[PDB]
Write a protein that binds this ligand. Structure first.
Ligand SMILES: [Mg+2]
Ligand SMILES: [Mg+2]
Ligand SMILES: [Mg+2]
Ligand SMILES: [Mg+2]
Ligand SMILES: [Mg+2]
Ligand SMILES: [Mg+2]
Ligand SMILES: [Mg+2]
Lengths: 115, 127, 99, 156, 100, 84
RNA sequence: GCGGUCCGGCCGGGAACUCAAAGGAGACUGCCAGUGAUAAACUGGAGGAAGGUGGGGAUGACGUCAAGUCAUCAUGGCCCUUACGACCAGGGCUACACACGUGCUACAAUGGCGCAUACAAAGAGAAGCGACCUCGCGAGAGCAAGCGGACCUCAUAAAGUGCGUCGUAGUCCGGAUUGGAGUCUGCAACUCGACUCCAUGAAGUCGGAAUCGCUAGUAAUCGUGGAUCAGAAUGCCACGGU
C-alpha cells in the first residue's frame, strides 16, 4: 500500500490517493499519473504491482518529503541569518509579505494573547 | 395566415406564431425539450394547452430573446396566451380565471443610494 | 453616392427641430429623402457626494442624455450639398456628414 | 400589519399534479433561492412513494401530512411579568404550514445518502406514523398537555 | 487649494508635455521589444537621467477651478461639489438630476 | 519584480560611484539615498551606508544577499514592544 | 412571407413583428354589490395589461440640535512673513501586548470536483477598448483588423441542466499563511501594488450574553459593469439571473 513516498497513501481511488502524498498537489498528481499511463477507466483486472513499480522510479525526479522540507528550512533560515527584513518578520512572528499587523494577522502570530 | 402573440415576463420578449398542425412546437430553431432544461420550465409553456383543446391541432413556431430561464418561460407563456386572443376570444371566462392574459408587471427594483441591495440597509450598531 | 447624416444633441426637442429643418431644405433643392431613425439614446449618470466635509447617504445623481438621429440621402446633388453647408442650425446640434 | 389587515398570498399550484400544497412545500424546502433543484427532488420523492405505497401517491402524502399536522400551538407571552406559554388552536392555513416546516428539518437530521432519499424515507415513515415527525408531534402534545395548566393563565 | 500646489501642477504637466513625445514612448518600446539587446540597458540609464518630473503618473489631476485633489471628475474637470453647484446654476448643458 | 526582459534595476549615480570605488579598491563606506537600487555583484565585499530616513545604516555586501535591494537592509521603524 | 440561399439574416427583398425613441390613449373608487352615519371612506366583484398613491425615483414645510465643515471654497477677527511661506531626496500616514465597528471568504453533500450544453441587462472606450492568428500551463508577449461606436473591442455571463466520481472523512471541504519561480504598470513594487504557475495547508464541523437588515421580485444568493484610476476593491455607485 505504501507509495515511494515515506507516507502510506490510502487505496481509495487513484488521483485522490496521489493527492494524499506530500510534495504533490492535484496538478502535480495529474502530471505523475500522465507519466505512468494509468487511468481509472481501465478494466478492473491487472490492478497489481504492475504500475507502482513505474511510480517509484518516476517520482524520484521530483523534490518531495525530506528533500523539499530540507530546502524549505534552508530557504527561511537563509533568509533568517542574512539579517533581512523578510527574515526579521519571520523572526518576530509577524506578517512577512506586507499584510497589516494592526489587526487580522492571527494565523501567523498564533492565538490571541490577553493583557 | 399566422396568429401573432407577444410575451414578456421580466426582461424578455417572446415572438409566438400559430398555424394549424399536429401539436409540434419549435423554439429558437430548437426543440423545447432540448432548449428548456428544467422540467417546470418546460411544462409551463404547455400549461394553457390543456384547458384549451387546441393542443393537438397547432404547430407553433416561437422565437424568444432576452431575460433568463424562468423569465423566458414566463414570456413564452404570455406570448402563446395573446396569440390565442386573436383566434377565439370566446374562452375568456376560463382563461382569465386561470390568470394567463395578465401581464406580469412585477420587475426588479433599482438600487438606492445608502442601500446595499436596493432595500437592504447596512447593518449598524446603536452605540 | 448615398450619404448618412448623424446628429447629436443633449435635448430631445432640439434634435426634432433640427431634423425637421434639414428636410424641407432638401425639398427646397428638390431631392427625395428618407425618414430619420431614432438610434438608442445614451444616458450617462454621475453620482456625486453633496456634503462638503462628511456624509455618505447624502448624494445626488446627475444624468446627461445624448440623443442620436440618422438621416439617409438617396440621390445627392451639388445644390443639395451646398444647401447643407449654407443652412444655419442650432448650436446644440453637431454635424457629422459622411460620404 | 398594524394599520391595514391583509390576507394570504396566492401561490401558483403544483404544475405536475395541480396541488397548492406541493408547491408551498417545495417553496419552503427551497433554500438560498434554488427552486430548480427543489422541484427535481420533490418529484423524485413522490415517485419513490408511488412505487412503494399505492399508485396514487396523492393520498400517501396526504396521510403523511395529517398524522403530523398540529391543531394546538405554544405561544410565549408576558402579561403580569411571568412567562406564559399559552396554548391556542391554530387555523388550518397555519396548521399545515408549521407541519411541513418541521418535516423539512426532520429530513436534514435523518442523514441518508442524499437529500432526495431522506425526504422519501421521512415521508414514508410518517405514513406508518413511526416517523420522527410523529415523535415531534407527540413531543408537542406532551408539552401541550403540560401547558393546559397555563391554558387558563392571562390572555387565555 | 494652495497657490503653491497649483503652481507645482502646472510645471508638472508642462514638463510631461515637453518630454512625452521626444524620449518617453520610444524608450518604453525599445525596452519592451525582444529584438534588441543591451541597448535597452543603456536606454534605462538615460531614462532615469531625465528630470523625472516628466512622467504623466507624476501628475495628479485636480479641480482646475479650485485645486482640490480629491473628488475629481474627468469629464467636467472639476471637484464633486463644484460640479454640483455649477449644475444647479445651469452651466453644464444637458445635465439635470437623475431619476429612474 | 521588474520583468526579466527589462533586466534588473540600478541607479546612474549609484552605478557610477560603485564602479569608481571598485576600480580604486574598497576604501570607504558609500553614502547613498537610493534605496530603490538593486544589489548587483559588482559591489561585493563593500559597506554601503543606506538611508532609512534619519540615519544612514551601514550594510555589508555578501554573496547570499545579491539580488535583494539596497534599501532592504535598513528597517525604517523602531518598535521595541508594547510593554515597558 | 417572397424568391436566392458560400445554406450562417448571409443576398436582393419586406417594414408585419422584436427593438430603437417621438407623440398620443388608458387607471379616475370610473360602474355593481355589501358594510358605514343614504356622507366620506372601507370590503368584495365586473371589465381591464395594470385597482385602489400600479410598483420604485426625484421632490424634505415652519423649526430643533452654538450638529459638521475656517482642510473644497469665500470670509470677520487672530498670528508668521530669513518662516506657521517655498524647492528638493529618503521616510510616514501601511507601526502592533489589545479593544470596537463595517464588510469579504468559509466550515460543506441543496456541496466539491471534471466534461458537454443556454439565454441577460447596464456601462466604458481615441495618450483609450483592443479582436483574429502565433508562442507561452499561466497572468501575459508578438503581429495587428476595426471602432468616437445599436456595426468594432472589453464579452462572455455565473448559480442552471445533463452526465460520472467524491460518500460524510478537518475530507477531491476551507482557504489563510509560507517558500520558490514569474507576468504587467510605472523613473522606480525593500518598507509598500495587483495578478499567474508549482510547493505547504492554519483556524474553522454554523458560533454566548446580546444584536441588525428585510413585508415581494423584497430578503437570500450568483455573476456583470462603471467612476476614482499609469497600476492598485472584499469599499462605493449601478445592472441583470434564480
Ligand atoms: Mg439584484
Ligand atoms: Mg488659498
Ligand atoms: Mg495618481
Ligand atoms: Mg460645535
Ligand atoms: Mg468640530
Ligand atoms: Mg488611512
Ligand atoms: Mg481602475
Amino acid at each position: 500500500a505504501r507509495i515511494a513516498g515515506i507516507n502510506i497513501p490510502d487505496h481509495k481511488h487513484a488521483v485522490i490517493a496521489l493527492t494524499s502524498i506530500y510534495g504533490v498537489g492535484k496538478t502535480r498528481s495529474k502530471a505523475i499519473l500522465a507519466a505512468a499511463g494509468i487511468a481509472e477507466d481501465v478494466k478492473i483486472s491487472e490492478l497489481s504491482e504492475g504500475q507502482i513499480d513505474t511510480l517509484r522510479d518516476e517520482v524520484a525526479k521530483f523534490v518531495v518529503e525530506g528533500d523539499l522540507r530540507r530546502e524549505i528550512s534552508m530557504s527561511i533560515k537563509r533568509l533568517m541569518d542574512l539579517g533581512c527584513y523578510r527574515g526579521l518578520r519571520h523572526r518576530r512572528g509577524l506578517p512577512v509579505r506586507g499584510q497589516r499587523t494592526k489587526t487580522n494577522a492571527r494565523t501567523r502570530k498564533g492565538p490571541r494573547k490577553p493583557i | 395566415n399566422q396568429y401573432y402573440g407577444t410575451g414578456r415576463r421580466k426582461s424578455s420578449a417572446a415572438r409566438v406564431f400559430i398555424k394549424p398542425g399536429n401539436g409540434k412546437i419549435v423554439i429558437n430553431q430548437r426543440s423545447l425539450e432540448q432548449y428548456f432544461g428544467r422540467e417546470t420550465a418546460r411544462m409551463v409553456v404547455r400549461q394553457p394547452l390543456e384547458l384549451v383543446d387546441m393542443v393537438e391541432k397547432l404547430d407553433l413556431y416561437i422565437t424568444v430573446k432576452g431575460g433568463g430561464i424562468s423569465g423566458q418561460a414566463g414570456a413564452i407563456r404570455h406570448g402563446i396566451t395573446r396569440a390565442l386572443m386573436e383566434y377565439d376570444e370566446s374562452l375568456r371566462s376560463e382563461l382569465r380565471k386561470a390568470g394567463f392574459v395578465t401581464r406580469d408587471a412585477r420587475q426588479v427594483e433599482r438600487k438606492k443610494v445608502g442601500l446595499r441591495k436596493a432595500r437592504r440597509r447596512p447593518q449598524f450598531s446603536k452605540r | 453616392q448615398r450619404i448618412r447624416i448623424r446628429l447629436k444633441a443633449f435635448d430631445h426637442r432640439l434634435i426634432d427641430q433640427a431634423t425637421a429643418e434639414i428636410v424641407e431644405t432638401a425639398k427646397r433643392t428638390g431631392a427625395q429623402v428618407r425618414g430619420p431613425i431614432p438610434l438608442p439614446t445614451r444616458k450617462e449618470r454621475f453620482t456625486v457626494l453633496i456634503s462638503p466635509h462628511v456624509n455618505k447617504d447624502a448624494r445626488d445623481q446627475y444624468e446627461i442624455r445624448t440623443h442620436l438621429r440618422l438621416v439617409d440621402i438617396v440621390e445627392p446633388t451639388e445644390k443639395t450639398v451646398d444647401a447643407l453647408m449654407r443652412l444655419d442650425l442650432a448650436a446644440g446640434v453637431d454635424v457629422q456628414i459622411s460620404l | 400589519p398594524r394599520r391595514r389587515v391583509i390576507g394570504q398570498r396566492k401561490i401558483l399550484p403544483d404544475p405536475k399534479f395541480g396541488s397548492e400544497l406541493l408547491a408551498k412545500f417545495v417553496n419552503i424546502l427551497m433554500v438560498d433561492g434554488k427552486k430548480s433543484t427543489a422541484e427535481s427532488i420533490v418529484y423524485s420523492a413522490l415517485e419513490t412513494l408511488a412505487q412503494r405505497s399505492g399508485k396514487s401517491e396523492l393520498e400517501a402524502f396526504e396521510v403523511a401530512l395529517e398524522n403530523v399536522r398540529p391543531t394546538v400551538e405554544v405561544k410565549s407571552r408576558r402579561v403580569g411579568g411571568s412567562t406564559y406559554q399559552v396554548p391556542v388552536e391554530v387555523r388550518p392555513v397555519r396548521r399545515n404550514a408549521l407541519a411541513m416546516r418541521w418535516i423539512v428539518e426532520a429530513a436534514r437530521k435523518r442523514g441518508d445518502k442524499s437529500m432526495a432519499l431522506r425526504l422519501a424515507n421521512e415521508l414514508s415513515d410518517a405514513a406508518e406514523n413511526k416517523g420522527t415527525a410523529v415523535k415531534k408531534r407527540e413531543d408537542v402534545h406532551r408539552m401541550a398537555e403540560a401547558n393546559k395548566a397555563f391554558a387558563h393563565y392571562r390572555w387565555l | 487649494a494652495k497657490q503653491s500646489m497649483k503652481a507645482r501642477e502646472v510645471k508638472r504637466v508642462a514638463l510631461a508635455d515637453k518630454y512625452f513625445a521626444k524620449r518617453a514612448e520610444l524608450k518604453a518600446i525599445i525596452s519592451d521589444v525582444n529584438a534588441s539587446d543591451e541597448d535597452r540597458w543603456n536606454a534605462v540609464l538615460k531614462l532615469q537621467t531625465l528630470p523625472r518630473d516628466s512622467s504623466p503618473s507624476r501628475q495628479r489631476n485636480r479641480c482646475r477651478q479650485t485645486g482640490r485633489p480629491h473628488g475629481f471628475l474627468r469629464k467636467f474637470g472639476l471637484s464633486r461639489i463644484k460640479v454640483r453647484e455649477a449644475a444647479m446654476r445651469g452651466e453644464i448643458p444637458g445635465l439635470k438630476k437623475a431619476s429612474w | 519584480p521588474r520583468s526579466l526582459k527589462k533586466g534588473p534595476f540600478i541607479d546612474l549615480h549609484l552605478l557610477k560611484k560603485v564602479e569608481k570605488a571598485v576600480e580604486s579598491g574598497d576604501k570607504k563606506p558609500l553614502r547613498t539615498w537610493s534605496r530603490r537600487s538593486t544589489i548587483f555583484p559588482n559591489m561585493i565585499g563593500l559597506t554601503i551606508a543606506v538611508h532609512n530616513g534619519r540615519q544612514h545604516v551601514p550594510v555589508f555586501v555578501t554573496d547570499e544577499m545579491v539580488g535583494h535591494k539596497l534599501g532592504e537592509f535598513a528597517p525604517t521603524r523602531t518598535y521595541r514592544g508594547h510593554a515597558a
